Paper text:
The completed glycoconjugate is exported by the WzmWzt ABC transporter to the periplasm where the O antigen is transferred to the lipid-A core to form a mature LPS molecule that is shuttled to the outer leaflet of the OM5. Wzm forms the ABC transporter’s membrane-embedded permease domain and Wzt contains the classical cytosolic nucleotide-binding domain (NBD). The CBD is fused in tandem to the C-terminal end of the conserved NBD of Wzt. The CBD is essential for capped O antigen export in vivo as transporters lacking the domain or carrying CBDs with compromised cap binding activities fail to export their lipid-linked substrates.
Indeed, each CBD monomer binds the methylated monosaccharide with about 234 µM affinity and at a 1:1 molar ratio. No binding is observed to unmodified D-mannose, suggesting that the CBD specifically recognizes the sugar’s O3 substitution. To delineate how the CBD recognizes the cap, we crystallized the isolated A. aeolicus CBD in the presence of 3-O-Me-D-Man and solved the molecular structure at 1.6 Å resolution by molecular replacement. The monosaccharide binds to each CBD protomer on their flat β-sheet surfaces, formed by β-strands 3, 4, 6 and 7. Specific contacts are formed between the ring oxygen and the δ2 amide from Asn313, the C2 hydroxyl and the ε2-nitrogen from His350, as well as the C4 hydroxyl and the carbonyl backbone from Ile299. The C6 hydroxyl group, which is absent in Rha, only undergoes water-mediated interactions with the carbonyl of Met353. Compared to CBD’s apo conformation, these interactions position its loop connecting β-strands 6 and 7 (residues 352-356, hereafter referred to as ‘trap-loop’) towards the ligand-binding site, thereby trapping the O antigen cap. The 3-O-methyl moiety fits into a small hydrophobic pocket formed by Leu300, Thr346, Ala348 and Trp362. The indole ring from Trp362 stacks against the methyl cap through CH-π interactions. Altogether, our data demonstrate that A. aeolicus CBD specifically recognizes the methyl-cap on the non-reducing end sugar of the O antigen via interactions that would also be consistent with 3-O-methyl-Rha forming the cap.
Numbering used by the authors:
A (entry chain B), B (entry chain A): 252 to 395
Write the structure that this text describes.
Amino acid sequence: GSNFKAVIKEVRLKSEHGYTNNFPSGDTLFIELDVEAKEDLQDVVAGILIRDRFGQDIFGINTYLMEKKVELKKGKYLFTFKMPLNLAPGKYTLTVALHKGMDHAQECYHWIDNVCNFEVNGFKKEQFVGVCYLPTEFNYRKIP
Amino acid sequence: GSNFKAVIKEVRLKSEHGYTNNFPSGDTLFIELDVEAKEDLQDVVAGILIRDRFGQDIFGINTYLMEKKVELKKGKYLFTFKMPLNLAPGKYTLTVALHKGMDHAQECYHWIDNVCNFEVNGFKKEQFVGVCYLPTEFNYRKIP
Ligand SMILES: CO[C@@H]1[C@H](O)[C@@H](O)O[C@H](CO)[C@H]1O
Ligand SMILES: CO[C@@H]1[C@H](O)[C@@H](O)O[C@H](CO)[C@H]1O
C-alpha cells in the first residue's frame, strides 16, 4: 500500500474554539493534516472517511470528488478539511489518505485507518433522532 | 394510538420545481401535510421521521424540538417542512405524526408509519460515500 513519497505526519481535530476530540452535534469540525512531500508529486488526492463503531461508512469524500487539484513540491504543507458535524451523538473513527486517483487505484502514498477517535456528545442545534441531522424549517397556515 | 382529534389528510413531497418523489442528493425537500383539526387544540407538535429501506432511523425531528409553537383552531391547515436532503442515494420512507408533548407521551392525535416512499438518485453536488453528506471545504498551503 503506502509508499510514503508523501506522508501524513500528524492529524489534529479542531473546533472553532480549539483543539478537541469531543463535539456537540452540528459543531464545525476542522481536520488538520501535516503533510510532507519527499519529492515533487502531481495529481495528489487527499481523502477523509468517518465511520461508526461497526465499520459502517458515515461520510467519506476526497479532493478528486470535490474537484480540487493538488500539486505538491518537495516540502511541508498543511491540509485542512472543514465540515459541519451534523451527525448523531456517538463514537466515530476518522481514516485519512493521500493517494492518486479517485479510488486510489493509481498510486497509494499514505493510508492511515482510524487515525483519530472522536465523539459527538449533545446537540449544538436542535435535538433530533437518526444517524444524521438535516437543517429543517417549518411553517403552518390556516386554510379556509 | 391515534385519537384523530386532528388528522393528517394527505402528505406530499416537493422540490423547488414541483411535486416529486425523486431527488438528487442535496436537493431541497418540502414536505406538505394537509391537517384537519376537528376541535380546538393547543400545544400541538408535528413530527417527521425519515427511515432507510431497512427500517433504520435516518433523521427525525418535530416542532417541539425546533421550538416552534403550534395552536390549532377547528378547521383546515397546511403544514410545511423544508430541509436539504443530504442523504445517500437509495430508497427511503417518511413517517409523520401529530401529537402533544415532545415525545408523544402526553397525547397522540395521528401517527402514520411510512406515509410516503421516496428515493435519492444521483448527486446534485459532489459525489460522496457514507449514509449522509456533510458540506465540506478543502484547502492546502506550503509551510516552512
Ligand atoms: C480515506 O478517504 C477515502 C479515500 O480518499 C478514497 O477511498 O475515496 C473515499 C471517498 O470515496 C474517501 O473517503
Ligand atoms: C414522527 O416524528 C417523530 C415524533 O415527532 C416523535 O417521535 O419525536 C421524533 C423526534 O424525536 C420525531 O421524529
